[PDB]
Structures are given as structure tokens and as C-alpha cells.
Write an enzyme that holds these catalytic residues in place. Structure first.
Site, mmCIF file in Angstrom:
data_model
loop_
_atom_site.group_PDB
_atom_site.id
_atom_site.type_symbol
_atom_site.label_atom_id
_atom_site.label_comp_id
_atom_site.label_asym_id
_atom_site.label_seq_id
_atom_site.Cartn_x
_atom_site.Cartn_y
_atom_site.Cartn_z
ATOM 1 C CG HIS A 148 -0.409 0.326 2.604
ATOM 2 N ND1 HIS A 148 0.103 -0.794 3.319
ATOM 3 C CD2 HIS A 148 -0.294 1.266 3.500
ATOM 4 C CE1 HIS A 148 0.564 -0.452 4.205
ATOM 5 N NE2 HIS A 148 0.286 0.803 4.485
ATOM 6 C CG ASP A 149 -0.267 4.344 1.076
ATOM 7 O OD1 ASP A 149 -1.307 4.280 0.737
ATOM 8 O OD2 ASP A 149 -0.429 4.935 2.305
ATOM 9 N N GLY A 188 5.364 -1.303 2.055
ATOM 10 C CA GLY A 188 4.090 -0.088 2.269
ATOM 11 C C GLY A 188 4.996 1.228 2.268
HETATM 12 CL CL LIG Z 1 -0.538 -3.524 1.663
#
Ligand SMILES: [Cl-]
Ligand SMILES: CNC(=O)CN(Cc1ccc(-n2cncn2)cc1)C(=O)CSc1ccccc1Cl
Ligand SMILES: CNC(=O)CN(Cc1ccc(-n2cncn2)cc1)C(=O)CSc1ccccc1Cl
Ligand SMILES: CNC(=O)CN(Cc1ccc(-n2cncn2)cc1)C(=O)CSc1ccccc1Cl
Ligand SMILES: [Cl-]
Ligand SMILES: [Cl-]
Ligand SMILES: [Cl-]
Ligand SMILES: [Cl-]
Ligand SMILES: [Cl-]
Ligand SMILES: [Cl-]
Ligand SMILES: [Cl-]
Ligand SMILES: [Cl-]
Ligand SMILES: [Cl-]
Ligand SMILES: [Cl-]
Ligand SMILES: [Cl-]
Ligand SMILES: [Cl-]
Ligand SMILES: [Cl-]
Ligand SMILES: [Cl-]
Ligand SMILES: [Cl-]
Ligand SMILES: [Cl-]
Ligand SMILES: [Cl-]
Ligand SMILES: [Cl-]
Ligand SMILES: [Cl-]
Ligand SMILES: [Cl-]
Ligand SMILES: [Cl-]
Lengths: 258, 258, 258
Positions: A121-122, A139
Site C-alpha cells: 500500500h502507498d 508499504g
Molecule cells: Cl499492503
């Protein structure tokens, strides 16, 4: 016979350019957009809100656009954006990121993401990068252009992987990797610069020379980071490629891999 | 129930013995050949040109016969050959290799390729090998008979893994591993010889003793490789299993794991 | 939309609560029991004898309930039991264990088993544990409550991982990890305790203090394990959390990670 296989499931809110191919038993979920020339293989799961660009290829058993863990609140809008000419091999996992705080998960152009690699994520991947089998970005990881992460490279959350850098197989990266630097081991250690990659890109001899000297300034002459940045200032003004190196060290938040 | 599930896709070019079983949602692609008594599970992707022999088992979510990255030119013929009595577990990836230069990817007989393991292009596995979960052979890797690579073992391109050798879990192998040698760590280091494997094979007590002496000659007596090969010559003439060890050292191209 | 997708295969011996959901192209095999509120995604393979409890989520490309290797004899009964409120992400593999010698594979409640993680035969995971991506338990591994194994953590057969303990990314664990202890590296080494976790769990500041002192008794004062257990005795009787720690050291069969 049909470009969208009849055994695939395509959500009515998905938007696919007219020449998109989707293989049997694939799922293209709500809010997934797919641009011209892209080929989705069989047994692929796409979830949104996700935009995938042009001329991409996504292979079997991949899960692209999965839920981001720990959102600020239930139903905060998230997104994943994938650019053009990328190859995402079998088994790859890519999670979305949050939109409000500009922390979408983003992948640029001409990237190769090999089997079972994981994009947390991100995370933000630039252009012409190669993540070899089972590379995992935990991440909030930024991978700048032309970086090569060898097989089984693991990257701690918030780390930045500099342009044209290189990790050796099984490397465990906890700190930022400056542009061009080659790292190896668990825990990762800097070894040299990727002079090979420079030549393949066409760097002049003078810029390579100036990068070799820059490596020594940072790593081999007992300087603090602050002292090294001040000493590189002059060369960075003359050679945009040294400014890439210097800039990667100055914007390091987790310290640099040494 | 039918031996070829009606939900599986069998390409009109594929050639199957009459008793072959193929599970639901599996693809047996163009130019794949599958011999007598093989079972293909559900959710399997087979691509060619690929020959799978007799009495094999191939589990779910495996991609067997994928494209070689390392083509000299578009449409250079490539091939994967799998022998008899092999077990390929879930999620395994096996790439083809080039025909012209005799560099096909080849797997012999009685092998066990455990979940998510990866066999890169132009690799050659012998007989009775075990690749444990997530083992990865990057390319051009030769695994001789009876070798065991423990889970998450990573092997650099061009390395040779000797007969009856063993790697510890998480090992990262950059150099050749002589026959019978046990290696561990990232980067890998030689520790001892696989005496357990020798006793499971029935070696005489004199041959085990000669192999223990041979290990010390190479690794513990400050000898160069040249010196060690000269000193092993006598024992190698007497004991075929010491000749295996000596021959593995002599044909090393990347140095031996030390 | 039907709770059980018409494209899924449900073996007539399987036993499901009425509200169970099962996504397309998923197989619920013979002897699989599934309880109230559990959601099985698409492309899932479940094999038995296996019991899954209530309010569980199992994601795509997961193989849950696979065969235990080298049974004492053909058809020795095996089992896998999963409790309630667990999340099993994509690509996870979980093998069964033997019933006769009390070695089933068992998972408690409120666990998060992240993508491509592996739970080998006869392993036992408690409650509120997190196995991050690609964590692998070789076999006969015990994971106590609230343990966090970071990505790519590898655990040798028979190790115990203590309650509230933590492993860093890419750790290769070959010995027991005492409760609360943080370990890193390949091979794994003890670094400290997880004081953060203790604070988030609400430990009193006196119990955290006594645990910090207990760490030093075992690891920083040149004691033998015997000496340390004798010295901890008093604090263990006063604080149940220090008894947790002491008891994890006393029941160590492979030595403790140092
Ligand atoms: Cl993730
Ligand atoms: C071919 N060169 C290598 O395999 C060296 N390499 C970097 C690398 C790898 C591939 C590419 N490309 C593939 N298509 C285009 N580029 C480029 C650089 C590794 O990561 C080795 S480890 C490894 C390798 C493969 C699988 C598992 C493991 Cl563990
Ligand atoms: C039972 N022995 C071990 O599990 C030791 N082992 C070597 C080994 C393993 C299995 C076999 N066979 C299985 N069927 C027949 N043989 C033989 C030797 C490991 O690789 C440990 S690590 C590991 C193990 C399993 C998954 C993930 C990981 Cl990380
Ligand atoms: C957010 N924290 C981290 O990512 C740190 N972490 C432990 C950890 C991770 C996740 C969780 N949770 C997820 N949902 C709830 N909890 C909790 C603790 C790692 O293992 C990093 S390595 C890694 C991380 C992710 C993928 C691959 C790799 Cl290699
Ligand atoms: Cl478009
Ligand atoms: Cl790949
Ligand atoms: Cl490398
Ligand atoms: Cl280098
Ligand atoms: Cl190069
Ligand atoms: Cl460039
Ligand atoms: Cl055949
Ligand atoms: Cl392919
Ligand atoms: Cl397996
Ligand atoms: Cl390959
Ligand atoms: Cl050994
Ligand atoms: Cl239940
Ligand atoms: Cl049951
Ligand atoms: Cl039991
Ligand atoms: Cl996950
Ligand atoms: Cl197992
Ligand atoms: Cl970590
Ligand atoms: Cl710590
Ligand atoms: Cl704290
Ligand atoms: Cl608690
Ligand atoms: Cl000990």
C-alpha cells in the site's frame, strides 16, 4: 473467438477500451478501468478503484488492486494507478493506497514486476524498473527509475530506492538506497555503484568518473552525511547525474544504507 | 466423471496419452505433450513446447512451460522436458529454455518440486532431487541427483549443485556446491558433508570415511583447489563416490562454496 | 446472487452452515466442515479432514487442508482445525497433521495469515497472531498468542515462538524464541523485547520493568540457562507475565535464540 472471454466476470461499472483482452476465469471488479492494448491473462483478480493504462500485460494468479490495511476510517476513497507498457507476472500482489493524502499506490511505465512480487500500500514505482521474483515492498516504498531489485529483495516500510540502484538477491533493505548504489546482504550493505547500468544507459565517461568520486566522498573518506553533501555540491551543479545521487542522499529519512 | 474435466481447455495441438487426467479450469496449451498416468490438477497453466512424461502430478496454481526472457531472436525454438514420477506442487513456476544450443530446461525422474519453487530458464535437474518451498534457480542452474535444497534457497545463475548436496533454509548460493557438501547462510558457506544422505543410500562405512577425509583435504588444510585435486586423485581412483566429489570440484566454473 | 456460487464445486460429504459463502471456481473437498459467517473467496482449494470455524475469510489461490508428508502408514487419520475470526490471505498453504499422536495442525482465533505464508504439518498457532507475507513454518512449529512474524520469516521444524514475541523481516529462526523476545537476521539473533506490544496490551509499568530485568538475567549476565531459570523464579511467582517468559525458556527443546 471473443477478446473478453465469456468465462471471465466483468463488473458493469468497469470500463475497458474496445481492444482489451481478458482471459477465462478472470474477474474485473467494480471501478476498474483498463486502457487500450492491455492483455489480462486467465485466473486474474482485478479490484478497484484502479486505473490500468495502455499496452500492459497481467498474468495468471495475480491479485491487483487489493484492499489497503488500516484506513483512517471506513470507506476513505483509495486508488491504484498503473501506467503503460508494464508486465506484471504470475502471482503478483498489488495493494491500493489512500487518495485524500495523495498516497495512492502508483506504478509508471515500462516496468517489469516478476512472479510473486508484492507491492504494498502507498508505494510508488517510477519507470523502467525491474522487481525480480518475490521482491516485497512492505508499504510506503518509493522506487525511482531504472532500479533493479534482485530476487527475494525485501524492503522495509518508508524506504526510498534511488534511481539506477541495484540490490543483490535475498537483500533485506531497512534504510534508503542512494541512486546508483549496489547493496547486498541481510541486513543490506552498500558495496559500489552500478557502473554497468550507467554504460548501458549511455552516460558519458566524465559523468561516470564524477559518480565514482562521489561514491568515495560519501562512503570511503570518513565523512558525515552533512560533510559529504557539502563536498558534493560543486560536482552536483556540473553533472545532473551527480545531482541525482546527492539529492537521493539529502532526501533520505531513514539514513542511507552503508 | 470424465478423465479430462469438461471445464478444462485442451489446445487442439496438444498431444495426451489416453488415460491422462486434467482437472477443472486447467489449460493445456499449444504444443504441450503429456504422457501415460500423469495427473494435472485444477487451476494449472501448461504452456509449450513442453514434454511431460509418465506418472507425474502437477498441483493447482502452477505455471509450467512459461516463456524464456533470454531469446537471441523472435521465435527461436524453446522447450521444457519433464521426465517420469515427478511431483510439482502448488504455485510452482518453470520456464522453458533454448533448443538450438542444447540449453532446454530439463527435469529428470522422481523429483519433488515443492510449493512456489521457481526453475528458471535453461536449468537442468537430475533425478531424486527435492526443491523445498520457494527455492529459486535463477537460470542456467544444474542440480545433480539426490540434491536437497531447503526452503527459500536462492541460487545464482550458472551455479552447479552437486549430487547428494544440501542447503540449509534461506541459503543464498553464489558459487558451485560440491557433491555431498552441506551449505548454509546468506551468503552460503560450506559446513560439512551430508553423511545422513549417504547412510540412507547405503554407502559402505569405508566410503563414508573416505568422503570425510576428502572434505578436510579441500576445506580444512589450507590447500588451494589445485593442491586438493592432486591430493584427492588416489582416493578418487579407489572410491567412485570420492570421484563424484573430486569431479564436482574440478568442473566448478564459479569457484566452490567455502 | 446465490451464497454458494453455481460455479464452485461442493463435495457431497462436506458440511456447511446455511449462511456460508463460497465464490466462483472454488473447491470445498470431501470432509471439509465450514461454520457460520465464513466467506470463501474465488479460486480457493479446501481439502479435508478439515474444520473451519465461524466468521473466517479465505482469499483466492489459497490451498487449505493439504496432505501431511511421510505418514507412519497409508491412511493414518489427519486433520486440520481452524477457529474463528481468522483471515487467510491469498496464496496461503496449510497442511494437515496426524490425529493419533495429538499432532493435528491447529489455528485458534483472530489470526491474520498474510499472502503466500506457509503452515506446515502439525503446527499449532494460538490466538491474535500475525504471520506476514511469505512466512514459512516448516512443520511441528508452535506459535503462542499475539506473536508477530514479519515478512519472509522462516521457522525450522519443532521451534516454538513465544507469546507476544516478534521477528524482523527475513529472519531465519532455528531455535526457540522466548516469549516477548525480538529476533532478527539469518541466522536469527535476540535483540530485546517487544515493549511496544506490551504497552498496547495494557501491561502495568511494574510488569514491563520486571520483564526488562528478566531479559537481562537470561541474556546479559553470563548466566547458563539453568542459573537464569533459578534466578527468575521469584519474579515469575509475583508476575504472571514473567512466568510466561520463564516457562517459555524452561520448555525450550532446541535451545533459545541468543
Ligand atoms: Cl499492503
Ligand atoms: C537474468 N539475470 C538474473 O537472473 C540476475 N537477477 C537480476 C535480474 C533478473 C531478471 C532480469 N530480467 C528478466 N527479464 C528481463 N530482465 C533482470 C535482472 C536476479 O535477480 C538473480 S536472483 C533470481 C532471478 C530470477 C528468479 C529468481 C531469483 Cl532469486
Ligand atoms: C521435513 N524436513 C524439513 O522440513 C527440513 N527441510 C528440508 C526438507 C524438507 C522437506 C523434505 N521432504 C518433503 N517431502 C519429502 N521430503 C525433505 C527435506 C527444509 O527445507 C526446512 S525449511 C522449510 C520446509 C518446508 C516448507 C518451508 C520451509 Cl522454509
Ligand atoms: C505495517 N507494518 C509492516 O509492514 C511491518 N511488518 C510487520 C507487520 C506487517 C503487517 C501487519 N498488519 C497488516 N494488517 C495488520 N497488521 C502488522 C505487522 C513487516 O513484516 C514488514 S516486512 C513486510 C510487510 C508486508 C509485506 C511484506 C513484507 Cl516483507
Ligand atoms: Cl485507452
Ligand atoms: Cl517471472
Ligand atoms: Cl546477486
Ligand atoms: Cl557491485
Ligand atoms: Cl549490465
Ligand atoms: Cl537514463
Ligand atoms: Cl511419455
Ligand atoms: Cl509465459
Ligand atoms: Cl509443497
Ligand atoms: Cl526464467
Ligand atoms: Cl551439516
Ligand atoms: Cl463452527
Ligand atoms: Cl473435521
Ligand atoms: Cl491434536
Ligand atoms: Cl496479504
Ligand atoms: Cl507440511
Ligand atoms: Cl523488520
Ligand atoms: Cl527490538
Ligand atoms: Cl513503547
Ligand atoms: Cl495480552
Ligand atoms: Cl540455550
Amino acid at each position: 473467438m471473443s477478446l473478453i472471454d465469456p468465462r471471465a466476470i466483468i463488473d458493469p461499472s468497469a470500463r475497458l477500451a474496445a481492444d482489451v483482452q481478458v482471459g477465462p476465469w478472470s474477474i474485473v471488479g467494480a471501478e476498474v478501468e483498463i486502457g487500450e492494448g492491455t492483455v489480462i491473462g486467465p485466473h486474474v483478480v482485478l479490484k478497484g478503484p484502479t486505473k490500468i493504462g495502455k499496452h500492459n500485460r497481467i498474468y495468471q494468479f495475480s491479485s491487483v488492486g487489493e484492499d489497503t490495511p488500516d484506513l483512517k476510517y471506513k470507506g476513505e476513497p483509495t486508488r491504484l494507478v498503473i501506467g503503460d507498457h508494464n508486465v506484471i507476472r504470475e502471482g503478483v500482489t498489488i495493494h491500493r493506497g489512500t487518495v485524500q493524502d495523495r498516497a495512492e499506490t502508483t506504478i509508471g511505465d515500462h516496468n517489469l514486476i516478476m512472479a510473486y512480487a508484492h507491492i504494498g500500500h502507498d508505494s510508488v514505482i517510477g519507470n523502467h524498473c525491474i522487481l525480480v521474483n518475490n521482491t516485497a515492498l512492505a508499504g510506503h516504498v518509493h522506487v525511482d527509475d531504472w532500479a533493479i531489485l534482485s530476487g527475494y529483495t525485501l524492503v522495509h516500510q518508508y524506504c526510498r530506492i534511488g534511481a539506477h540502484s541495484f540490490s543483490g538477491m535475498g537483500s533485506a533493505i531497512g534504510k534508503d538506497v542512494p541512486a546508483y548504489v549496489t547493496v547486498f546482504g541481510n541486513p543490506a550493505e552498500a558495496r559500489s555503484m552500478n557502473f554497468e547500468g550507467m554504460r548501458r544507459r549511455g552516460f558519458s565517461s566524465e559523468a561516470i568518473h564524477a559518480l565514482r568520486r562521489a561514491y568515495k566522498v560519501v562512503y570511503r573518506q570518513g565523512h558525515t552525511v552533512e560533510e559529504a553533501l557539502a563536498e558534493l555540491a560543486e560536482s552536483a551543479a556540473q553533472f545532473p547525474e551527480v545531482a541525482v545521487f546527492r539529492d537521493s542522499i539529502q532526501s533520505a529519512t531513514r539514513g542511507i544504507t552503508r
